[PDB]
Amino acid sequence: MESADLRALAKHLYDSYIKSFPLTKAKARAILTGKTKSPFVIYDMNSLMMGEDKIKFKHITKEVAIRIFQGCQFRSVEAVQEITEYAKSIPGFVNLDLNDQVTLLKYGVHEIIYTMLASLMNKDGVLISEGQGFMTREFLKSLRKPFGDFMEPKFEFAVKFNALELDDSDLAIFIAVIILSGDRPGLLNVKPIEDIQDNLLQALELQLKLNHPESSQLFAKLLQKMTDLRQIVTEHVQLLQVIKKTEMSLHPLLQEIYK
Amino acid sequence: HMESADLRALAKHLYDSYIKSFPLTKAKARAILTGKTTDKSPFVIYDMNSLMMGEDKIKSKEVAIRIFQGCQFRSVEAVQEITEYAKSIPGFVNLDLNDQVTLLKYGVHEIIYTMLASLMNKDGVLISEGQGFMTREFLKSLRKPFGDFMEPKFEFAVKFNALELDDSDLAIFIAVIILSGDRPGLLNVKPIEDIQDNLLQALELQLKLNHPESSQLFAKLLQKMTDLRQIVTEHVQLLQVIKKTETDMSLHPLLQEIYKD
Ligand SMILES: CCOC(=O)c1cccc(COc2cc(C(=O)O)ccc2-c2nn(C(=O)c3c(Cl)cccc3C(F)(F)F)c3ccc(Cl)cc23)c1
Ligand SMILES: CCOC(=O)c1cccc(COc2cc(C(=O)O)ccc2-c2nn(C(=O)c3c(Cl)cccc3C(F)(F)F)c3ccc(Cl)cc23)c1
Questions:
Q1: Residue numbers of B between 102 and 161 with CB closer than 8 Å to A
Q2: Do A224 and B226 touch (CB under 8 A)?
Q3: Which residues form the NR LBD domain (chain B)?
Q4: Cα dihedral value B30, B36, B39, B40, nearest 10
Q5: Which residue of B has its CA nearest to A182?
């Protein structure tokens, strides 16, 4: 592809990405750094109870660790729809076989949710409620039984990923590359998916050299993270399934929403 | 950063050392596998009877155990060849000695898988310096847990070999794997990353020059490189589970130490 076509693709994806996701990394970073109403901070039990009285979350119907976990699930379901809408803007995606569209999204959303959650995180906590809240890492890590160990790996990944210092225009292409993975199980027509991903990879490569000219082999470093995400996600799903098997107790309708 | 001439010089150095370090190259393996030559033809082992004839021609335990000891013996040799290759990588021996060990400990299995693919096609694997060829089917039909222990090596190889890398490409790729700064327990990550950045630069240019019509081959090769991470952990887990049931299995101390934590 010609460079002009690659920059057109990068800007097209950036524009759609800004429209698709409520809180961008740039805005999140402004909140986390203090360069912008202070968000309400949840740092222990009492501040959690006050936060759900002030913020009034949508997942509120239980134990504290459960309530937080269910807040995470509720937001992930929201993210899945935001990512699904974003995919439609990826040139060529909507022309793929409908089953392959479903397959790509089915196996991709988890890696993208992990990736984009890093935009909302620093080493000390995570932005919530479209940035109105900030729940500290220590409080999330100290949750009982497997919940503490379920939260901390997200921060562990985010701290390393954020050292790459990607911005939103970088992430918009990177997220598209993840979606267009030709090795997802059960794909019917791999060829056009790789054809698009090859185009996205060229655009990402050019974007990173222009946007980060002093960042050596950042392209290579980002690709390694992308396939790290594979196993991080499979570990996530294992814990996620063990959590439901050991704790759930949900209305079956709720189970289907979260299935 | 490095200038192109320096990057090509690094590529040629690595290829020279690789040829000096690894006795059976992919180029020779493919010459044997492709055939159309009378002098290099392997004896093919495809069942019990041919295994007995092969062990007489090629030169008292269960069959699956005997094959396993053949694999580990050769993996131990591979560790030795990989260790010798690493020392030739500019900067490696200058690193903290603990980090040298750590890099080798976590790197050799990913490299063995990579280089085992050179010896494989979809129907089997070259053995005994290419004098033999054992079919995939025969390996897959081994009893107990051994049959399923063998097949994933072929599964990786068929996909990896689709990239059509040659030895000069592989020499650099193998070097990139060794110089991974994210191995657990490394003491000084920064100088390892500095070397890897030079190796990644060299790999990128090598793949563009050697495979100009291969779209984003650099990116595809990097994706394989981090798949090997889990492919290896599945191997190691299986090997530990197998070892608990099979007493007739003894691991070489070199391998035993590699798998400890
Ligand atoms: C007072 C009540 O507190 C809260 O409501 C609360 C508490 C802490 C954090 C959050 C917000 O969380 C997220 C936001 C976003 C976003 O805004 O883009 C994306 C992801 C998460 C998030 N998912 N998750 C998962 O486990 C997960 C993931 Cl990664 C992928 C797929 C499915 C799931 C899940 F199983 F959950 F379904 C997290 C684990 C830890 C943390 Cl810290 C955040 C997340 C809200
Ligand atoms: C009757 C006589 O038969 C034989 O002598 C015999 C039979 C079959 C295959 C082989 C050759 O095998 C290898 C050769 C090389 C090489 O030449 O570079 C590298 C690797 C292998 C090889 N390791 N392996 C492992 O399991 C393994 C691995 Cl990957 C890494 C570390 C430790 C081990 C192990 F546990 F073994 F300790 C294989 C599994 C399947 C296959 Cl197909 C090949 C290999 C020789």
A1: none
A2: yes
A3: 6-261
A4: 20
A5: B220
3-state secondary structure chain B: CCCHHHHHHHHHHHHHHHHHHCCCCHHHHHHHHHCCCCCCCCEEECCHHHHHHHHHHCCCCCHHHHHHHHHHHHHHHHHHHHHHHHHCCCCHHHCCHHHHHHHHHHHHHHHHHHHHHHCEECCEEEECCCCEEEEHHHHHCCCCCHHHHHHHHHHHHHHHHCCCCCHHHHHHHHHHHHCCCCCCCCCCHHHHHHHHHHHHHHHHHHHHHHCCCCCCHHHHHHHHHHHHHHHHHHHHHHHHHHHHHCCCCCCCHHHHHHHCC
Q: Does domain A2-259 have CATH number 3.30.420.40?
A: no
Cβ contact B222–A224 (<8 Å):
yes
Ligand 1 site, CB within 6 A: A 48, 52, 57, 67-68, 71-73, 75-76, 79, 110, 113-114, 116-117, 120, 126, 128, 135, 140, 151, 154, 240
Kindly determine whether residue B218 and residue A216, on different chains, have CB atoms separated by under 8 Å: no
- The technique by which this structure was obtained is X-ray
DSSP for A128-189 reads ETTTTEEEEHHHHHT-TTTHHHHHHHHHHHHHHHHTT---HHHHHHHHHHHHT-TTSTT-S-
Resolution of the deposited coordinates, in angstroms?
2.1
- Shortest alpha-carbon distance between residue A198 and chain B (Å): 6
Topology (CATH) of B3-261: Retinoid X Receptor (1.10.565)
Judged by DSSP in three states, A218 sits in helix
Token pair, residue A207, equals 């974007």
Ligand nearest to the CA of A131: 1
